[PDB]
Each structure stands twice: as C-alpha cells, then as structure tokens.
Symmetry: C5
Subunit: 283 residues, 5 copies
C-alpha cells in the first residue's frame, strides 16, 4: 500500500476516546459484592503448584490483555477506486487512572505490625507490568512461558495449545516462531504467555515496561499534558484497516496480601486513550 | 467565548498571582490548641483499620483530601478572558523531615535508642491549574468501604446510592468536581482524563511501606500551561482554580505502630495574560 | 536601582570569585583538639531523643544549620551593579565515605566483625547564590519542640511568641533571612518561594534511615543564574551571598546506636559581570 | 574497504534483515523432552558452588554464554560493501516473569505459603552488531577457577596455559573472538574496547541477589550504528554478526535454595545500505 | 597561555589509547596464586579499628588512585597538544556474574544458595589533563593512623599530624596525583579550586549491600573542551590519565571479611595541535 498526501477539508481530523478496564481474573459479573463482585479489578487468590510437575493455575488467577476495537467512520464508497482514504492514528494521550486508590491502607490486608495485628493494611506492592498499543489491526502476539509444563485450563483462556492444538514444547520457554496469535478478544489472553511480537506489528505501535520483585514499591505518573507520537520514521501512523482501530493494554500494579496464609491478589487499573486521527490518501 | 483570538496588549494586560495551599491530611486547622488536636495539623489522626473483610469504616480525620482554592482575578468585561500561561510551583518544607529527634518509633526498638524514625512510605504529589474546578473520576480499592455520610464527599454523596463493583475500576457514573477544600478523599477521587479540557494537571505516585521520600525544590523551574495549540487554561468568570495534594508518607508512633499521614504545603505563582475571545 | 539596562564593557567588567563553605552539622570549628570535641568537626554531636510526646528538646550541637558567606565584590561607581551570571559548584569529599575501617557499628553484630558501617540515611543538598540574604520560611515537624533560646535562630526568636499549630504547615508570619552562618537549623528554615526574587536556589531531599548516599562531582558543569528575562542576581551594595547545606546521612556508633550527622563542604566559583542600572 | 566513498543508489541498494537470538543460559536446546532436561531450556542448570577457597569447578551447564549469529547478506561484486545503518532490537518475554504460581521458594517460608518467588537478582544485557566477530577481552573474578577443558571456550583454551593473576585485571594477552554460539562464558569474556572498530556494542549490568528485574520493550526505538564520521559497520565478505546476552536474574527452588539463571531471547532488525569503497 | 588557531596539515591530529588497572590494595606482585597474587584486582581483608582512638588501616586494604603519564609526539609561536575528547569504558562487569565461588553464601542457615556477588559502596572517577590531577585532602577521621611508608597521606605532605579541619575543607592539605597506586581515595579528592587544565568526572554510591550498576559501550564520546572551546593543553607533551573504579566488596565465609573489588578502565584520547603564544 502506497501512502500519499494528507486529506484536507471538513472533518478530515477526528479524536476518539475510550477507557479499557483491567482484566485481572475476576470477570465484571456477578456484580454482587458478596458473590465475587468484590474482587472485580483484582485477581482471585493466586493458587500455587503442588509439585515440580503439577502446576495448574486457575483462570481467575491469571491477568489477561485488555483490548477494544473501535469502528471509525466509513471513508470509501467504492473500494475499486485507484486512490482511497484511510484513517491514520497520529498520536495518543494515554493515562492509567486510579493510583490514588492505592493510598487506602485502612483495609483488612496483612497488617504491617504482625505481633499486635496493628500498623496499617499493607498497600499493593510487587511486580508491575504496563503495556499499551494502538494499531490498525489486532496486536500480533508471540507466546513464551516460564514453564512449558504448566497445565493451563483448556477452556476459558487462549493459551499456546489453543493455537497449535498440541502440548507446549521446551522451545516455548524461549522464542518459538510457531507459537503466535493475535489479540482479537478482551480478557482471554494471559499476559504471562502472550507478548507483543516484534517480528510483526508493522501497523501497530506498542510500549511496554516491566518491574519485578515481591515488595517493590509501585510507581506511576499521570498527566493530561503528555502526547505519545504514533508516526513511524517515515512520518506515517497506524493505518486503520476497514476503519478499525485497535487498542490493547495491561496495567498491573502489584499484589495485595491477605491475612489468611499470605494469599496474593493481583491489582490492575484502567487505562484511558484519546487518539487523534487524520485522513490519509493511499494507493 | 469559545473562539480564541489574539493576545491583548497594553497597560495591565499581564498579571501574576501567588498562593499557598496548606495540606488537608485529616486534622482540620482548628482547634488551634497544641494539646486538643492542633498538634496533628499537617498530619492525619491515627489510621484506624478494618475489623473484618466486610467492616471497613475509616474516620474522616484519617483520610487525606484534596486541597483547593478559587482565586479571583482582575475584572475584565468581542470579550477578554484571563489565560493562564505558566506556573512556578514548589512543595515547601522537606527539610522539616530531617527532625529525627522526636518520640516516633525508634530505630533501635530493643533498647529504645537510635533515632526517631523519619517519615517514610507511600507518596503522592498532584497539582492542577485550570479555569474551572478540577473534574474528578471516582475509583476505590473497595466498593464495600463504609465512608461517613457527613464531613466528606464520596461516591455515594454524588450518586445517592451505595458503591457498586464497577467503582473498583472505571465507572463513568462516578464523577464529581473539586469544588471544596478538604472534603474529597484522594483515595477515592482522581483527575478525570476524559474531561479537564480547561485544566492542566500533573501527578505522581510512589507506593510501599518504608520507601524513602524524595523531593526536589527550586525557584528556577517554570511549568508551561499552554496546550498543543498555544492556548492556556481560560478563566471562566475571572476565577482561577488551584488544586493539589502532597503526601510525603507516614510517621509511626511507639504505640501499636499507629501511622499518621504527613502532608506539605504547595506554593503557586501563576502568570496570566488577557486573551481576546469570541 | 530597579531598571536593568545594558551590560558594561571594557577593562575589568567581568570578574570571577571562588569560595568554599564548610558544613555546619552541629560541632563548631573550635575547640580544635581531637580529644576535646574537635574530632566531631564535620559532624553533629550524638542525636538526643525526646523523652515523651510533650518533651522534645534537641541540643544545638545535634542540629545541622545553614552555611552562608557574604563576599565583598570590587567597588563600583547611570549606576552599575554586579550581576551573577553563572556558578560552578561542587560538593567535595564523597570519597572519604569509603572509610569503612573505623569503629562504627559493625555490619556483623553477632561477632562484632565485617566492616565499619558507612554513612547512610537521609540526605539534603541545597545551594543558593543571590544579591541579598536567602529568604527563609519556617516550617517544623512539631510546633511543640522546645528548641534552645540561646545560640540558635528559631521561629520564636523571630516572632517573640511560642510556635502555633500553623507552624507545622505554611504560616506566612514565620519568615527570616539567612544572615548568619551556623545559626539557622535546616529542620526549621526553608527557602521561601514567595520571596527570593534576587536569589537562585536549588535543593533536593532524600529520606529514610539506611538509604545509600549518592553524589556526583565534576569540574565541567556550569549552573546558569540568569532568569527568564536574561538577568542574574544583582548584588546590592556589592555583596554576594552564598548559602548551602550538604547532609550525607548519619554514622552510627557501637554504643546504643548513637547517630551523628555527616556534612561535606561545597565549592562555589561564581562568574559576574557589570550591569548598567537606572 | 579501507577508503569509504559515496552511498550506492538504485534498485536493491537498501536491505533489512531480521533475526532472533535465543538465550544460552546453560541447558542446551536438546534433549527436547520435558522430563529429561528440556524443562530447563531458557535457564541454567542448578548453580554449583566451590567446595573450598582452592576448589571452584563450575559445570558448563551452569554458565551463561554469549549468543551469536552470522547472517549472510545479498551478493555484491571500486567495490561495494554492505553498511549497517541502524538496528531495532528488543528483548522479548518479560511478561512471562509474572508467573508466580509455580513451585519456586515461596514468599512466606515460615508457613510455606504466599506466591512462588519471581525471578530476581543480577541482570546483564549486552548486544552488538558488526561486520566481523565481536572482539573479546578475558577478565575473571578468580584466576584459580577450574573451568572444564571441553565444552566451553575459556582463557586457557586460547593461551594453552593456566590463567595468571593478571587475568583478574586487564591482561592484553587474554583475547578471543566471538565466533561460536553458546560457547564463550559471559563471566570470562567481555567486549574489547581496544578493538571492535567495525562493531557497535551496548551493555549494562545490575548486580545484587534480590534486585527487581527491570525491562522496557517497544517497536518504536531505533539505535543508530553510524560512527562519528557517519559510517556504520562494514560487512566483510557480506557477513553480518549479531551478538547478545540477556540475563534477567535467578529463580530459586525449594531445595537448598538452588539458583537457576533465566535468560530471554533478543530480536534484531538491521537496516543496511550499499556503500562504495576503494 | 594565549591560545591561537588550530594547527593544520600532516600529523596534526593524533589518537592514544591506554588501560589503567585498578589499585585496590594487593600489588601486581607476587604473581603466584598461592602467595597473594590471587588477591590482585582486590584489596586484602579490611581490618577494623580496635577503639575510638586506635584506627590503623593496613596499606593493602586501602584503594588508591590509578594514574599514567603518556608521552605525546615531539612538537617544537609554539605548538601544544590539545586533548579534544575521550572514549572511556570500565571493563569486566560481566565477571561479577561469577556466583559459584566460596564467598559468604546467600542462605547462611544451611550454607547453600549462591556465592554472594560483589555489592556495596561504589566509586567511579576519571580525569584527563595536561598536568597531574590536583588533589584536596579530606578524611572521615583526622585521628586515623595511616602508615608513614608506602602511602601518600596528609602527613606526608604537611610533615605534621592531621588537624580537625582535615575532616572538612582545609586548603593546606593539597597534593598532586604524580604516582600510581599511592594516594588513598578515602583521603584524596579532585580539587575544584585548581585543575584548570584537567577535566574530571566522578560519582559515588554508598551503602553496604547496594547493587552495583555499570553501563559500557564503544559509542560514547566525552568532550573535553571547556566553555571557550579549549581542551586540556599538554605541558611538555605529557598527557595525564587518572581513575578509580570501585565496584563494592566481596564478603568471605570467615567473620564476614570484606575485600574491595576494582575494575580496569580504558581510555582513547583524541588530540590536536594548537598554536599558542
Ligand atoms: C470457595 C472455595 O474453597 N473454592 C475452591 C477453590 O479455591 C479457591 O480458588 C480461587 C482461585 O480460583 C482462590 O484461590 C480462592 O481464594 C479466595 C478467593 O475467593 O479469591 C481468596 C480470598 O482472599 C478469600 N477471601 C476472604 C475474604 O478470605 C476467598 C474466600 O476464602 C472464599 O472465596 C470464601 O468461600 O478465597 C479459593 O478459595 C478451588 O480452586 C476449587 C478447585 O479445587 O475448589 C473450590 O471448592
Ligand atoms: C481519644 C479516643 O480514644 N477516641 C476514640 C477514637 O479513637 C481515636 O480515633 C482517631 C481516628 O479518628 C485516632 O486513631 C486516635 O489515635 C490517636 C490520635 O488522636 O490521632 C493516635 C495518636 O498517635 C495518639 N497520640 C499519642 C501521643 O499517643 C492519640 C492519643 O492516644 C489520644 O488522642 C489521647 O486521647 O490517639 C484514636 O484515639 C475512636 O475512633 C472512637 C470510636 O468511635 O472512640 C473515641 O472515643
Ligand atoms: C559528656 C556528657 O555526658 N555530657 C552530657 C550531655 O550528653 C551529651 O550530649 C550530646 C548532645 O549535646 C551528645 O548526645 C553526647 O553523645 C556523645 C557526643 O559527645 O557526641 C556521642 C558520642 O558518640 C560519644 N563518643 C564516644 C567515643 O563514645 C560521646 C562520649 O560518650 C562523650 O562525649 C564522652 O564524654 O558522647 C552526650 O554525651 C547531655 O546533653 C547533658 C544533659 O543531660 O548532660 C551532659 O553532662
Ligand atoms: C525438580 C528439581 O529438584 N530439580 C533440580 C534437579 C534434580 O534434583 C535432578 O536433576 C534430578 O535428577 O537438579 C538440578 O541440580 C543439578 C545437579 O543435580 C547436578 O548434579 O549438577 C547440575 C549442574 O551440572 C545441577 O546442579 C538440575 O538438574 O539442574 C537442580 C534442579 O533444581
Ligand atoms: C582464603 C582466606 O581465608 N583468605 C583470607 C586470608 C588468609 O586468612 C591468610 O592470608 C592466610 O594466612 O587473610 C586475609 O586477611 C588478612 C590478614 O590475615 C592479615 O593479617 O592482614 C591483612 C591486611 O593487611 C588481611 O586483613 C588476607 O590475606 O587478605 C583475608 C582473606 O580473606
């Protein structure tokens, strides 16, 4: 596809906005705060392997990618025309919202004074993972796991086996080019399995960062003044195939730890996107 | 006026205004008495914990809230509006955290020796300048938290209904405006990125329980408030809104590790210019 | 006086001055004897703790204070004034903190072995250059602190009244000028961002109890002192004021974990030019 | 290709090539079986310790080695040479470290509860792109270390003599070239700054035992390979050499705290252009 | 003194490279790996004060400055060599990934885990100049009893015991870095009041278990030109290189004895001829 001039005139530039809620493990329903809804925004209690050969994590303990497909206004009455128009994503203002909520240290988590069961309710700490992507097609994913022996459920999550129809091999602990997918569904692709594929994603921009550890302080910045440029080295942004715009993210802040056997629950926060798009002539 | 035209020139077309906003960590400014509660001013009262998974009832004086002030600008009225161009802002008093001679939990607890443990832990710094109140989006750790009905503005104050599970993520129904000082808890109310077209805000968060506080201060740094089109916040009816919160962490007492939030005041010096509008 | 005109040119229109400011951590320069107290020079004396929630009286020699110097510039005299354009400044001696062979609390307390624990903890670095004394704003951890009435300048020295609860936040009445070396405690007195129009200051704070100290030093870094209008500090009566504090942390003794503050000296090389004024 | 001339223009004068290099932490790619050792691929085998000050014999499968690949470029032949202009490189799979549901040493060892401790500790990230093998300089912690003679390339492999005490600092005799994947230990062999005129390398090291691993990844970052004269690596005989190591830290088992190194693969996309040379 | 135009023509630019090995305490000889050579690149075991008034560190426990004076091509309106830029790198941080030795183990309860890697206080300084690096003395404790022979200390220069002012800035306590492996880094610091003809760059990170951090690349150039566009000028065609690169300590299994670790530093200096008057 040959990229030409920018389209000018009325309605040649648009802005669209969306929020993507986190997918930490507990689904949005049931809504009742006594039936599981109290865990929404969190995972359920992380369950551990029982031996070196028996690692069966429950689906509601595994954070998954958030995604949304936004439909843009149709540009072309006739797709057989020599020159067409496409929506081009120029820039995005993105923000992770709600870090202030982590200042709640008055709850019933493991307390900081364990002798007297006093102090404060230990705040969310530990491993953090923040990735976002904006593209004109689904985010391309590359599988890679800690342990190819992990017995993921066959129903309820998309894993390497879901794609290949075969058990994971040892190569899946490093880069196995066979283990590929596309982020085409919200709350289904575990982030411990599926990574942005650097060998593809020519029409997507992604930005990720990881900080590990168990008690690591979470850090976050937020402003409405920061614009992320989406143009490539040739001045071209993601081009929206069939007017579809794909937003993908995950924003893990760490864990809270309960007073019962140090059970951990992942915490995620929602992410806002405001994308500026312009019309581009293409051949 | 929504259409922004040329900058106004001539006598008194530019103005500077300055203000300090004191922190609102939980203890109110009065009683002033250093025996009857005033000794906690600049701090929260001792943080009280939930008694079970379903019983979390924090006291109002344990919850840091947003600071805000609405400043009146010179009378003006093709109309003119005041436009905020830039701000010099500074959090004052970090040197006071070098007081390690007090009666906090000591660093050597066996012998009651060492130094008085200085302020440490979770830190939160946000400031905003706009031409209308800061737009707020509610999001909480726990939708079951039983906040007081009087003395604080919470999600239930706005919706007239109990919080729902969606309030633990982004629920577009849970919105407010920062229109009162010392009333909106920072654990509930966040800058709304979907609004605030006429406000600039800047925030950062560092968590943990014993994290060293970090702060820089200088009178040489200017924050530009102009947007991508070169236009700053425009002051509706000549009102300028300043908002902030500056939490440095907690001190911990010698009695059951009781934690008190510490906040510090923020200085603002805002430069404004008159703008023609239609 | 107030109107700033062109730069002066010709013979001796530019000058450079250099000075070092030694730290003022609590022990004075005298007595010099290494067995009568002089061995603590560059350090505070042992930090003394409050005996109750209402009895906190730190000794003056345990409180770090601001360093300052007023330097006389060449005589002058429309009128001319000296203008400070830039400064090269450096904190010297961080390599001395690599002495881990002393008699501090050892890293293996089971066998009393390992190394002598190096200086760690809270760090505070501020410097200023101006044409008049640094303007100070008081703010304390605890308005009940019983600072000594002799040998130190505190809020009560200025107001002639006991501190009030507002002194734990921003109280505009509690102001002073840094006009004496080794007299203004850094846990009380902060650069005032509401004044200091003729001074530039730069500060940073890192808290905690065991935080690793960090420092960079080079002779290749120039700090520009010109304001947004291209005008540096103007030296009133040909006096240049240098102010600083550079706290590296504490060392800890083998006797009940007694802490001593450590400070380091700061070098200043200021470039000045003559300015025509009206 | 000593004298560098103009860039070649016209059809097929620019090319891009991509490759991934898998880590070489110690366990080879085969046997593939997940019950015969294949379950350790991407990791080292369990690190074995010295039995005394004079007996340090690490097993080859416990020692991370350099990854490398030689890529063949399009045939070319005033001659032409391929010139590497820039590279986009990324370390893939940091999200996999969010698996804390396995059978590692648990976070609560008192009750054997909590989560499976994630990978932590020392991290080492180096990559290089050149027109010939990466030049290596030997330097070790301990010249007395008894490395295996077969299966690894060590200083003794090169010199045919035991290591000397100078091998613990810079000994210019101890040099090699990175000409084989999975053979040169990263604890022995470092990029040689005195050579590598036709290679660019970029390395960083973070030590410690429980240090949190940190990684950024994006497809938007380009690394320029051009030198100060605007010339990138020139590919001798149309061969492009890629080299790397990406150690994330260790996992720790529930059996005597046995540590296993973890490595991650690195992606490279190199842009190359034809250059006239004489 | 008066700096004129750059010199043009054949051989008007030159490049010199050198490596400076660390001077952590154990000298290069004896070379034998059973007679002390096994500590080369390290200090010997740090020895502690026995009282508040008795602190006597052994010379081989004290890291000292590395330095080299390099001879430049003969020259002689006169000409001088001018140092324009330097590429510098600390080599061997990968060696700190050896956690298979006999250090204090990470699991001390069972004596298992890994051999604890080098951690703690780190100090990285380098300098390039046309004369010896000017040094300013400043110590933790003016009562420290350094050896009179084998190290250059404040007493070596002044001929008198240290005074309390030596714990802060005492202008009397000055020296020049004119010898390799002799000037303790805990005593001697770059003097910001001198060094008009040298550029130096230093950083310090303290603590006892702090993770060491290091970056290395052959793509980074440090400019040596001052604010007027003039680099260090080499007096008598001598170029001075100075450095120290301390990575932390290793800790043994015997009473937590600490040994400092240093790494070597590479320098590649670009110089040009300058007309001077
Ligand atoms: C209810 C029960 O026992 N269910 C069994 C399953 O165990 C549950 O598995 C999930 C993961 O799928 C979690 O680990 C559960 O732990 C929690 C949870 O619900 O998330 C952790 C919470 O911190 C805890 N809440 C409180 C307030 O203590 C919560 C409660 O204890 C229970 O929800 C109350 O009933 O538990 C864990 O319970 C198990 O996966 C399944 C398969 O064998 O068998 C179920 O019976
Ligand atoms: C005085 C009292 O017991 N009041 C009861 C309430 O308890 C108080 O609740 C507040 C929060 O609203 C704080 O947790 C109080 O703790 C402190 C405080 O006043 O902030 C913590 C201080 O560190 C402590 N100071 C010292 C020097 O010890 C202080 C004192 O102990 C008391 O203030 C002295 O009276 O307490 C806490 O006391 C409780 O919320 C209420 C139940 O509805 O009942 C009140 O009677
Ligand atoms: C000498 C004495 O006991 N004086 C009493 C005062 O106590 C002193 O107060 C100062 C603060 O003003 C310090 O805390 C002193 O602690 C030190 C010191 O001199 O700094 C701490 C040193 O680490 C310690 N040095 C050694 C090597 O042990 C030092 C020595 O113990 C003494 O200096 C030797 O005499 O002490 C502290 O001693 C006190 O303020 C006053 C009121 O009660 O009464 C004084 O008599
Ligand atoms: C699941 C488990 O315990 N895995 C161990 C593994 C097994 O104990 C063993 O392979 C079963 O036969 O042992 C590991 O440690 C190795 C030693 O057993 C071997 O002697 O030497 C190896 C180094 O060459 C290594 O130290 C292993 O196989 O890697 C450690 C592992 O956690
Ligand atoms: C392998 C080992 O234990 N190495 C020790 C070493 C030996 O104990 C000793 O050299 C063999 O006799 O001792 C070291 O400690 C030294 C002291 O023994 C010596 O008295 O003084 C030295 C300082 O000048 C040093 O402290 C050593 O030789 O460095 C420590 C080493 O780990």
């Amino acid at each position: 596809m040959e990229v030409l001039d920018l389209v000018t005139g009325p309605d040649s530039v648009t802005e669209i906005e969306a929020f993507l809620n986190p997918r930490m493990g507990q689904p949005p329903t049931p809504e009742s705060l006594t039936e599981g809804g109290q865990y929404y925004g969190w995972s359920r209690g992380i369950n551990l392997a029982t031996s070196d050969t028996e690692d069966s994590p429950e689906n509601n303990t595994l954070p998954t990618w958030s995604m949304a497909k936004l439909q843009l206004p149709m540009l072309n009455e006739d797709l057989t025309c020599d020159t067409l128009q496409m929506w081009e994503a120029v820039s995005v203002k993105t923000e992770v919202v709600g870090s202030g909520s982590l200042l709640d240290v008055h709850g019933f988590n493991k307390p900081t004074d364990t002798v007297n069961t006093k102090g404060i309710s230990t705040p969310v700490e530990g491993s953090q993972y923040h990735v976002f992507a904006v593209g004109g097609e689904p985010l391309d994913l590359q599988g890679l796991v800690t342990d190819a022996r992990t017995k993921y459920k066959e129903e309820g999550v998309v894993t390497i086996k879901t794609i290949t129809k075969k058990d994971m091999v040892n190569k899946d602990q490093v880069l196995n080019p066979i283990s590929k997918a596309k982020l085409d569904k919200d709350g289904m692709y575990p982030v411990e399995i599926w990574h942005p594929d650097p060998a593809k994603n020519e029409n997507t921009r992604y930005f990720g960062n990881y900080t590990g550890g168990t008690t690591t302080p979470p850090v976050l910045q937020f402003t409405n003044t920061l614009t992320t440029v989406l143009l490539d080295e040739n001045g071209v942004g993601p081009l929206c195939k069939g007017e579809g715009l794909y937003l993908s993210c995950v924003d893990i802040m760490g864990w809270r730890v309960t007073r019962n056997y140090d059970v951990h629950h992942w915490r995620g926060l929602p992410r806002y996107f405001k994308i500026t798009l312009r019309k581009r002539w293409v051949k």
